[PDB]
Each structure stands twice: as C-alpha cells, then as structure tokens.
Amino acid sequence: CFEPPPATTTQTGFRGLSMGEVLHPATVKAKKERDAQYPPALAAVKAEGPPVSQVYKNVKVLGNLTEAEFLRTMTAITEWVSPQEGCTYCHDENNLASEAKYPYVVARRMLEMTRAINTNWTQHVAQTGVTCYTCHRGTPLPPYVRYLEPTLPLNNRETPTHVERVETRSGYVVRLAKYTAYSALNYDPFTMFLANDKRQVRVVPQTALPLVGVSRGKERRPLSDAYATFALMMSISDSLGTNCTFCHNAQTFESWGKKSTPQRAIAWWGIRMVRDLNMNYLAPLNASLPASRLGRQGEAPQADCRTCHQGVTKPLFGASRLKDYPELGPIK
Amino acid sequence: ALLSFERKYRVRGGTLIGGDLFDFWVGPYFVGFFGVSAIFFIFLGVSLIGYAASQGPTWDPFAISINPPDLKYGLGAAPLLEGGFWQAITVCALGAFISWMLREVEISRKLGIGWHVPLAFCVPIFMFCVLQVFRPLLLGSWGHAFPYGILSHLDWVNNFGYQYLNWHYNPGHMSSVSFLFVNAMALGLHGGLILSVANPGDGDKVKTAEHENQYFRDVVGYSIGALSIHRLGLFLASNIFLTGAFGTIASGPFWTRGWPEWWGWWLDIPFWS
Amino acid sequence: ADYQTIYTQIQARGPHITVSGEWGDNDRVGKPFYSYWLGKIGDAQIGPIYLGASGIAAFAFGSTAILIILFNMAAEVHFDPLQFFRQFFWLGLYPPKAQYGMGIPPLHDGGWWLMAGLFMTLSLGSWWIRVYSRARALGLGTHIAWNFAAAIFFVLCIGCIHPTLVGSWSEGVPFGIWPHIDWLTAFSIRYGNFYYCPWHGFSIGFAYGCGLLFAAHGATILAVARFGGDREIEQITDRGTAVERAALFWRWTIGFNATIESVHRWGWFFSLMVMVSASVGILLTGTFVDNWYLWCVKHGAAPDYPAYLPATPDPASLPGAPK
Amino acid sequence: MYHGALAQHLDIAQLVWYAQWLVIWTVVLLYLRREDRREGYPLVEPLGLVKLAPEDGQVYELPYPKTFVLPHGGTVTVPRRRPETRELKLAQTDGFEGAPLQPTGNPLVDAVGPASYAERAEVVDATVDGKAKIVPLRVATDFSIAEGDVDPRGLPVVAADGVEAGTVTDLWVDRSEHYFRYLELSVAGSARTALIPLGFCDVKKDKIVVTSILSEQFANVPRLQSRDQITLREEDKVSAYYAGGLLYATPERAESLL
C-alpha cells in the first residue's frame, strides 16, 4: 500500500510554491543499478591503414573509419543490441557483406537515425547523446516501445496476462490506464501526439476574454483536447519518473518565462525529436520487418519518452559515450 | 452594554489561570488570561506581517506573500527576509489559536456549559499543525510548508496537488471531500428544516418536533432526530480534517508516486489481472 | 462529562406517531421497525416511507439513467463480468469527444450521455416536487426546496447550461467515478486555473464556512443539551436558558451573537451560497472569461514570484524553431 | 473582438464581482445581523434615562417585529420588551463597567450565574395533539425502556462526595421525541422527590453517579408544582440547579484549576 520514509525532495520553484521532485530512495537505487549495466567504452584503437570504404565491400555509413576503428564499432553494436545472439544476428557467417538478414538493413538505418539524433537534436540530447544501448539495453527488441494501440506490459520482456493481451477487448481500459499513470483518462497520448505532428498539444487560451470567432459552437476545440493533453502529461511524467512541477509552475501551465523550468523547454524539443524519429526513421521500417514484429495494423514498433528514459529524468542518469564513439555523432 | 438577559450570568469564576486578575469583560468581550495572551500574539503576528510586507515588492493585498525558507535550510532558523519572518509569524499563529481555544473553555466554565465548542475548534488547529509543522518535520524542511498570502497559498495548494499527478485520487482527500460536501448539504437541510417549522408562512401556526421527524421519514424514510443532527453535524464537519489529515501526511512521507497509481493495490490483484 | 451528547444511555420505546398531512396519508408504505444500535446515536425508528407520485417518477427516471450508464459501462469491458468489477471506478459514459457544436451527437459518441443526462434531470425535478410538496402537505415552509433548487441549478450549469452557452456538448460532466473526477482538471486546465476564478473562491469560502458553522452550531447545542437546547423550536418561541447561554458564549467570545433562530438562517444562507456562487462562476466561464489566471493578471490581482531555476523562453517563439 | 468586453477596460465578469460583494454585504448586514437582534435587545446601559425619546441606533438595528402563531393557541412577538424583574442576589466586585458580579447568598437557591434560569412560560410543553410532552413512566404507561439498557428504577444515586443520596423511582420521557430526559429520585432522609436531567447522570448498571452536586445539596433542588407534569420554566429551574453546581458545589470549583 505505502512507501516507508524518508523521501528525497528537491526544489524547482521559489520557496513556498511546493515545486520539486519527490523520490523514494529504494526506487532510485533500483533504477541506478539497472542503468549501471551500461557496458563501459571499449578501449581506444589507433587509426591505421586505409578507410574501410576501400577495404570492405558494403560499407555505406561508416566508410571513413579505419579497420580497427570500424571493428571496434561492430563490437560495441553487438554488446549494445545483440550480446546474447552475437555477430551472426545481423550477418551471414560466410559473407559479412550480405544484407540477407533483416537486422542488417535495420541496423544500417538505426546507424543513420542514431547519428541524426546526436547531430540534429542536440537541443534535446546535448553533449550526453545516445547510443544503441540507450534504447535497446542489450536486446534486439527494445523493452519500451509503442504500437498504434496501447499494449501491456510496458516492458515487453515480461509475459502478458490473458487480459493484458491486446486481443482481449475486456482489458483495453486497463491497457490505457497504465499508459497514463493509472488515470481513467480515455485518450491514447501516443497515437494522438507522438506518432506524428498532426495535433497541437497546447489547449489553453492566451487571452483573458474569449476571442469572437473561435469561441462559439463548432469554432471551438472540444473539451476532449484538454483531457488528451492532460493524458499526455500524465504519461510524460510517468515516463521520466517525475511530477508536473519538474517543468511547470501549476499557477499557469500555459505560461513560459518564470513559470517554467528549463526542463520544460528541453521536453518541448523532445516532443519534436520523437515525432521526427517515428515519422522518418521508425515507422517506415514496417517494410523491412517480419510480420511478427508488426502490430495489428502492420505498424512497426515506435518510440516514446520511455523508450530512452525508462523512468529517469535523464536516460541512464546522464551516462554518455559520445566522446568514446565519435562515429555515432555529432557529424560535421 | 448588556443584553436584556445577560447580567445574571456575568459572575466571577471559571478561569483556568490567574483567578480574579483577568476575570472581567471589555465591552462584550470576556478577557481572562488567554484573552491577554491572544491579543499579545495577535499584535506580535500582525506586526511581523506588516514589517515583512513592507520589505516586499508590493502592497496589493491579493499579491502580498510571506514565504517559508528554501528547502536547503532544513529544520533550522532562516534569515528573516528569506523565511525567518514566516517562521516567527507561524509561532504567533499557534500562540493566537491555542490562546483562543483556551479562552473559550474559560467562557464555557463560567456559563456552566459543555466544552464541546473549544473541543471542536481543536480540529482546525490540528489540521493547521499537520500542514505547517508535522508534515514539514516528516520531510525535513520548513520549506515544505505553505506561504501566507491571499492568492499565494492557493498556488502552493495547486502545485502540492500536482506533485502527485492527480490529487483527486488521494483516498484521504476523497474521504475529506465527501465530508465537506455532505456537511454543507446537511447544514442546509438542518437549517431549512428548523426554519420551515418555525416559519410556515401565511399566518399558519408554527409546527412541532413531531412535524420535523414526520417530514424526513416521509421523504427519505428516516429521521435522526433533534439532538442527534447536532451530534452528526459536529461529526461530519470534524471529519473533513480528521480524515483529510491522513491523505496529507501520507503524501511525501509515505507515498512518492502519483495518487492514481496507489489504486494498483486493487487493479493489480493477480486473481483478475 | 455529559454522556448524553455522545450517545443515548437509556433508550425509550413507545407507540409510533404519525402526523397527518393534507394528502397522501395512505401512500405511506412499510411497517416501522427499530434498531437498537442506531438508537444509540440517533432515533431508533426506521420507516415507514411516503411513496407519492413524484417519488415514483423520480425512481422511474433515475433507474433509467442508471441503467443507460451501467449498460454503456459494461460495453466498455465487452461485458466481461469480472473485469467490470475490477475496472468499475475507471469506467464511464462520456459526452461527445468530437466537436458537433450543439448538434445532437451520435449514440456511439455522446448520444447515450445526453440521454442519461435527460433522465437524471427529470429524476431531479421529480424529487424536487417531492421535497417541496411534502413540506406544504405537512404545513411547513419551503426552505429546504429552495436550497435544493440551488443545488439542482448548479448541476444543470455544469451538465447542460454551460455547454449550451458556449455551444458544445463536449464540455459536459462524464458519468462515472474517476471520469467525473477527471473532468474537473480538464475543465480547470481549459479555463486557465480555477483557483483564479473569484466564484470558485466564493463557493469555497462558503463551503468552508459550512464546516465552521456546523461544527460550531453542533458543538454549541451539545454544550447546552443539559438545558434542553436540542428542542430548538420551543427555544425560538420561548427563549430558555439554553439559548441564553449559547448566545452569551459566542457574544463573549467574538463580540456579537445570533439567536437560536437566526443561526439557522446563517447556516441556510451559507449552504445556499456554496451553490449560487458556483453557478455564477460556471455561467461566466467560457461565455465571458477564457483564462481565469490571465483575467486576474489583467486586473492586477495575480501574485508573481522570482525565478528559482532560470526563466525559460517559449522555444516555439525562437527564430527557426520547428512547429 | 472579445465576448464580455465593455468600453474603457471593463468586462462583465469584473462587474459581477462588485455585484456579488454588494449582495453578500446586503444580506449579512441589513438582514442577518438584524435577525440576530430579535432577542435581548434593546441593550441595557448604566441606566438608560432618556425616557422621552429613543436613541437613533437602537431603532435602526432592530428588524420589524414578527409574530409566531403558537400551535396550541397564543401568539409571541419578537423582538419585545422583556426586562428581568426578579431581584438578583449579586454584588458588584468593583466600579469598572465589566467587572464580574459576586453571589451574596447561596447561588444555587438564589439561581444566579450558571444556576440562572430563563423566565420561560409557566406552561406545560405539549405533544402535537395537546397532551403533556414530558411525563414520568407511571403516567406514560405505553412507553418502555428498550431491551438492552439499564432499567434505573431501584438503583441508588451517588453524589460527588460518594454518599448515596437517594433512589431512582421513575424516568420522565419526551413523548414527542421518544427520548428520556429526566430521572426522578427520592432524596433519602427528606421525604420528597427530585428530578435530574439525564445529561447530569452517569448511568452505571448498579448505580447512577452524579458529579455536579453534593449529596446534601439534593435537598434544595427546585420542586415542581404538580407531581406528574412539568412547566418549561420548571425544566429551566431544575436543569440550571445542577449546572450551578459545576461552578459552586464546592468553594474550589470557582477558583482556578491551576
């Protein structure tokens, strides 16, 4: 039922406003240990010999690396994505230039996506960056992805209940609730807001009085947009293991300036980045995936805030490998 | 000066401390020793509010705000401008409230009546302590307490709630809200009923105890009775804070997640998971 | 201590009284029975109950509304009885999610909600007639009915008057435990934080005052139960020492006092004002104010605070930022 | 353009704000606070001598009289002139305006302070249909003690000093509300009966404990006119007597507890 004291608390607004984090140490420790499994950087290698564009036969992304540099990458990729499966997950034992296994082609696009993240989305990932490990955590299927309908459990490494299974219709409300921090909000924030750029998150008017011409009847946004934004915010908070005051002074959710923390701006960039990733890198990959990876509408698994963050306000508590693997970005 | 029936009640005695020294009235007000301590604390607190408010940005009453210290000062004294005034004012408040309660027991003794009213007045004093003293003790800073300002204290209630994603799902809150609602409803019913019996209108004659009970038996099939509705009303009102205090004390010290998630004890039973 | 104020020490039994009303004396059904444990803290007699036309009409319409809600709820769990009990709190009947304006919504998107709203409203009106006419039948003033009227009026405000004034049924209160709770935040978020709505403030002021008054009034009567202060009607018409002491307790405490009758007017008025203030607030919201916080800023009332972590510009307004 | 805008930086909600305060203060000041004054007004000063004309504020603070049509005949009008006639056996302890009064005699018999009774009608309170409301069980023979509960009839009454003071002979019941309000008891060694409000009674299974008065003080409990019914003023006299004991039964009860 309850969590024993003490609680760790932080301050994120002026004194007296009750803004800041409330954290259970046990829970933080369990997440710290889970995230400390991040494999350490492989030892640096001397840049020696010709570029692998001249040495190997089918190297389209990593072509400016030397042989030892490139094989160091391939070791790191195997550690991050398929340590249990090994190099043969993506490769033919007898022909390392064969694209015959689908993980090869996907991994190539993932290489491009990852460098895109570290080069074009520094407004969100800063100097910390991502690697394949950030999402994959040592398995080819990342533990936290989303379909065009809610699935349970959130961690696909756990085995679903009959009711949790997406085909059991009697369990839909619970599948939806657990994605919105157990609220009864009747909206799926992922397909509404993170799958594409079609919907506006902001719903609150920016004037005191209602403007004539947007304020009556069918000119009005339905109230459901406000439910939906709230649902997105429940989901976002739960995905970072935090509460609203991490980003907002609830005195005025819609105001910036002194009424928002810098984390709110970073979160804003995060919404745009996730949209780019899903629309332009992850959703097109239903062409290249087996039918057992796709959802009930032939969609590929896509990313939300939890995919990288897994319940922590900084993924892997700020761990970085950017300086150790320049080939993953940023790219000049 | 005096109500037509008042003089025969204006007798000596019933004090708790000081005997005759403070046993007197000033206008309608009984004084007593706790009358004196109350005025002391009120004068001190209002002075500190005034001094603190003048060192602040504005004089608009809606925007004045005396705030507690940053969390980093823990449970220690903080510099006057950045939390100290809040600390001082808080102590005056407790002095004033407790004095006020004890003054009411003295008035009760002199009139030979029950002490039920100061007893009931303990509940809101207790709730004030839950918010400003006990819960900040459990968390380790006075910084978690609420600020003194007409509108600013609402911003604290606001953010405090959203620190647990949706406070409405707090079970102590649900209980508290339910007593606030039914208490307001019962008071309407009780006042409505009494007035309806004494004031039928039209020169019609005033009705009876039996009419009172007949009405509620007719409408809802039961009538708790005259004395009992007064006991129930004290019970209902008191439980706004008596049950609410659990939902407040729990948040932070004994629960750090959102309050919707707390209901997983029900939703996630494996039997029907 | 006066143990009588805690519970009845020695209970009494006697023949059941029946006050005759101008009509309907035969529509009292049931045989009265007595509960000894109830009788410790209250009156021991349960029943009979009056059973007029308006009361049955209320039960009829109410059950229809309940049934429409429960059926839609069960549809939400594809009629699995076990998941229905599990998920009960999270199930709901929703007004339209899409913007149809004031057009009648499809049954699958708000029509059933509108239906359940109609039958609940009829049930409330029917019960109101019961509350009113029962008073006149027994020769009593109609004070309760006018308080109850304000409470019904507030429900109509959040249920359909405010939707029709702004012109969208999408703004009604859903039916269900958690979902009617969720509406409060959606609404407050839409209209710019309800803490900054002065009529929220008024309503809360009166609601808190109802707690203050009923705690204070209840405590007062119990403190004078030894002199019979619970027999309030005859203390109104013939002031006894009970209400003299009650009046003098408050006068010597706060400097002024009520009478045994006027304290009930206070209480009645405070109760009424919870609902009247709430209704003015909803009636103004959306029709004449769009963001209550900005409205308080416009009129110079909102508090401001220093930044703690750095002030943060809206990134969407920086040059070259994506949409 | 804006819904709710008016000329020169006014909007409708701003006006309603003012109107709402005006409504509140009107009802509170001009209505409720005058209703509050239908008892005990006009106030009493160190002799209000101006018999020729009333002072203006005393007229302004009062509501128009209202008349109650009583259920068994009669009318009451409030407010009205009701000075307290009876001589009070109290003396001013000082010259100050709000100094307390002191009892000159025995305050329980003299009915001052917490022992004061109101001057209610010397009238028996009545049921809906005219009968006496508060009657002992010997008269109210269709009323019983509920099965479960002490029958006090026969039990002794122990006073504050631990002395048995009498024996409970009957319970008086409210026939309108089905609720016992008094015990009747014979005071031992005095050949008379006394009534006790239940609220002063600690009902145990072998005794009735009564802490408000001493055993000897049961002798001077106000007596009733009739044996089998009570008037509203008598109810006040009886109830007040024990309440006066809370402060007066012993010299130490009026002084500070600390």
Ligand code: BCB
């Ligand atoms: C977004 C945040 C929200 C929120 C956050 C919230 C928090 C954080 C807490 C509450 C609490 C409470 N909320 Mg809740 N809330 C409530 C109702 C309530 C109260 C019933 C309950 C107790 C308030 C209290 O402690 O007073 C305190 C009053 C006191 C202490 C009175 C002190 C008086 C003192 C003794 C004397 C003062 C004397 C003066 C200075 C003298 C001057 C007098 C002059 C005239 C001379 C309703 C009815 C709603 C609705 C309709 O939505 C709601 C929504 C919300 N609440 C939002 C969801 N609420 C409290 C609770 O119980 O939670 C379980 C609480 O801690």
Ligand code: BCB
């Ligand atoms: C846990 C949640 C709490 C809460 C949540 C809350 C909400 C959500 C709202 C209020 C509102 C109010 N609160 Mg607040 N509050 C207040 C006082 C106030 C008033 C400004 C106002 C109406 C109160 C009322 O009518 O009650 C009933 C009592 C009555 C009717 C008797 C009259 C009391 C009098 C009007 C109070 C005036 C006090 C003075 C302004 C302050 C003293 C000044 C000094 C210098 C003498 C005090 C004095 C305290 C203390 C000592 O604990 C307190 C604690 C809390 N409030 C907790 C922090 N309160 C409302 C408001 O409009 O604020 C702007 C409002 O919407």
Ligand code: BCB
């Ligand atoms: C984050 C969102 C919040 C919010 C959102 C909110 C909204 C949107 C509205 C309120 C409203 C109100 N809020 Mg507020 N709120 C309140 C307190 C209050 C109430 C005093 C007031 C009136 C509601 C009421 O009494 O309904 C209880 C009584 C009701 C609902 C009447 C029911 C009567 C009906 C006849 C009953 C009959 C039912 C049938 C028998 C059953 C049949 C059903 C079947 C057929 C299905 C407190 C004390 C706090 C604190 C401490 O923070 C708070 C914070 C919040 N509120 C946050 C700001 N609140 C209302 C208001 O005043 O706005 C100006 C309002 O409209």
Ligand SMILES: C/C=C1/c2cc3[nH]c4c(c3C)C(=O)[C@H](C(=O)OC)c4c3nc(cc4[nH]c(cc(n2)[C@@H]1C)c(C(C)=O)c4C)[C@@H](C)[C@@H]3CCC(=O)OC/C=C(/C)CCC[C@H](C)CCC[C@H](C)CCCC(C)C
């Ligand atoms: C500030 C003003 C307050 C206020 C005022 C007032 N509120 C009143 C009156 C006043 C003056 C009445 O005169 C009337 C009444 O009659 O009271 C005895 C009434 C009402 N307020 C109810 C509920 C409510 N008030 C709420 C709030 C506020 N109100 C605000 C706070 C809330 C909240 C907070 O959500 C709720 C849920 C119902 C009990 C009742 C209507 C039943 C009905 O409309 O029928 C609807 C028809 C049905 C079939 C529903 C059946 C179930 C219900 C519980 C009815 C069952 C009764 C039945 C007799 C049981 C038989 C038992 C028998 C076998 C032994």
Ligand SMILES: C/C=C1/c2cc3[nH]c4c(c3C)C(=O)[C@H](C(=O)OC)c4c3nc(cc4[nH]c(cc(n2)[C@@H]1C)c(C(C)=O)c4C)[C@@H](C)[C@@H]3CCC(=O)OC/C=C(\C)CCC[C@H](C)CCC[C@H](C)CCCC(C)C
């Ligand atoms: C469930 C229990 C209910 C309940 C019960 C009862 N309530 C009682 C009694 C009972 C039984 C009394 O016997 C007593 C009384 O006599 O009635 C007239 C009383 C009283 N209830 C008051 C206020 C009240 N009740 C509230 C709530 C409930 N009550 C709940 C609902 C609320 C809110 C917010 O809800 C308020 C504001 C005063 C009017 C009065 C105390 C006067 C005092 O104490 O004098 C002493 C103090 C002063 C005169 C001023 C002191 C100034 C200090 C030093 C400096 C200010 C500091 C302050 C903290 C700053 C705050 C700023 C602010 C904007 C944040």
Ligand SMILES: CC(C)=CCC/C(C)=C/CC/C(C)=C/CC/C(C)=C/CC/C(C)=C/CC/C(C)=C/CC/C(C)=C/CC1=C(C)C(=O)c2ccccc2C1=O
């Ligand atoms: C200057 C100096 C040295 C003075 C010394 C003396 C001294 C201690 C003075 C104190 C000065 C102070 C601090 C005064 C402030 C007084 C205060 C706190 C007033 C608060 C008033 C408020 C806002 C009350 C809210 C409650 C309210 C609306 C009450 C209105 C209705 C009333 C009067 C209710 C009380 C009341 C109740 C509850 C009954 O049940 C009852 C039953 C039968 C008869 C009368 C009553 C009755 O009067």
Ligand code: HEC
């Ligand atoms: C999927 C996540 C892979 C795992 C595990 C391993 N490799 Fe890989 N490899 C992968 C891709 C998508 C590519 C193409 C790279 C590009 O820039 O286009 C490669 C390439 C190679 C090569 C060069 C082969 C050639 O074209 O001649 C070699 C030699 C190679 N990979 C070796 C290698 C080893 C030894 C691995 C286990 C340590 C390994 N790879 C894992 C995808 C994936």
Ligand code: HEC
């Ligand atoms: C989150 C932003 C990711 C990062 C960074 C990387 N990957 Fe990824 N990958 C991600 C998703 C959401 C998916 C879809 C689920 C799926 O299993 O397809 C994938 C998929 C792959 C695959 C295909 C594996 C399979 O389907 O069995 C491979 C081989 C893969 N990803 C490799 C890979 C590499 C090498 C990465 C770093 C260069 C990398 N991914 C980053 C999410 C994310």
Ligand code: HEC
């Ligand atoms: C940071 C990681 C956040 C947390 C935790 C919460 N919110 Fe949020 N919110 C955030 C951003 C970046 C934005 C802007 C979205 C955009 O695309 O522009 C928002 C927006 C809102 C809004 C809408 C405000 C408007 O202009 O209409 C609301 C009402 C809101 N947020 C509320 C809210 C609540 C209640 C939260 C805790 C449950 C919460 N947010 C968390 C960033 C972050």
Ligand code: HEC
């Ligand atoms: C991997 C591709 C990510 C996805 C998807 C999302 N985030 Fe992220 N975030 C990521 C990194 C590598 C970092 C850097 C950590 C650091 O040390 O700077 C971040 C940072 C944030 C922050 C800043 C938190 C802070 O304490 O300063 C926030 C508020 C944040 N992220 C929010 C957020 C949201 C709301 C997302 C979904 C829209 C989201 N992130 C996705 C990596 C990735």
Ligand SMILES: CC(C)=CCC/C(C)=C/C=C/C(C)=C/C=C/C(C)=C/C=C\C=C(C)\C=C\C=C(/C)CC/C=C(/C)CCCC(C)C
């Ligand atoms: C002209 C026509 C077509 C349109 C106008 C129709 C019209 C007047 C519509 C009005 C609609 C209104 C007033 C809607 C208001 C709805 C509101 C305020 C709903 C609020 C809360 C609902 C709740 C809490 C319902 C929960 C439902 C359940 C728990 C299932 C029902 C079962 C029950 C046992 C009910 C118990 C409720 C409670 C006593 C515990």
Ligand SMILES: CCCCCCCCCCCC[N+](C)(C)[O-]
């Ligand atoms: C809007 C509510 C309409 C409900 C109609 C059904 C109620 C019937 C009223 C009968 C009243 C008869 N009467 C006056 C003798 O009590």
Ligand SMILES: CCCCCCCCCCCC[N+](C)(C)[O-]
């Ligand atoms: C609980 C919300 C209370 C907010 C009170 C704000 C009221 C502002 C009214 C302003 C009156 C108009 N004017 C001219 C003085 O600005």
Ligand SMILES: CCCCCCCCCCCC[N+](C)(C)[O-]
């Ligand atoms: C926010 C709700 C406002 C409620 C206001 C009720 C206050 C009661 C004022 C009592 C005034 C006393 N007196 C003697 C000056 O009239």
Ligand SMILES: [Fe+3]
């Ligand atoms: Fe009463």
